[PDB]
Amino acid sequence: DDDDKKTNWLKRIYRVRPCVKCKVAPRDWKVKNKHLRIYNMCKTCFNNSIDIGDDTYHGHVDWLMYADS
């Protein structure tokens, strides 16, 4: 079933690319209608970057959660 191909790719995408800043924790994310937004950083590193005033790694990639648009 094609929705499972999409789902399994998303599970994999989320798993193999950890937080861009600390490289170990997995990334923060949220569900955004029919998209999954994967933020570049875990929450700890995100809150940290506000504290240290660095916005270099701020960002996200949205992913349609279904096989068919």
Query: Which residues of the chain form contacts with a copy of itself (CB under 8 A)?
Result: 2, 5-6, 9, 13, 32, 35, 40, 59-64, 66-69
Task: Report the residue number, 12 or 26, with the smaller CB distance to ligand ADP.
Answer: 26
Nearest distance in Å: CB 12, ligand ADP: 20
Query: How many chain residues interact with Zn ion (CB under 5 A)?
Result: 6
Beta carbons within 10 angstroms of residue 67's beta carbon: 13
H/E run at residue 5: helix 2-16
Residues 6 or more apart whose Cβ sits within 8 Å of residue 21: 40, 41, 42, 45, 48, 49, 57
Residue 50 lies near Zn ion (rule: CB under 5 A) = no
d(CA 27, CA 32): 16
What is the contact surface with ligand ADP in residues (CB under 6 A)?
28, 37, 39-41, 43, 46, 58-60
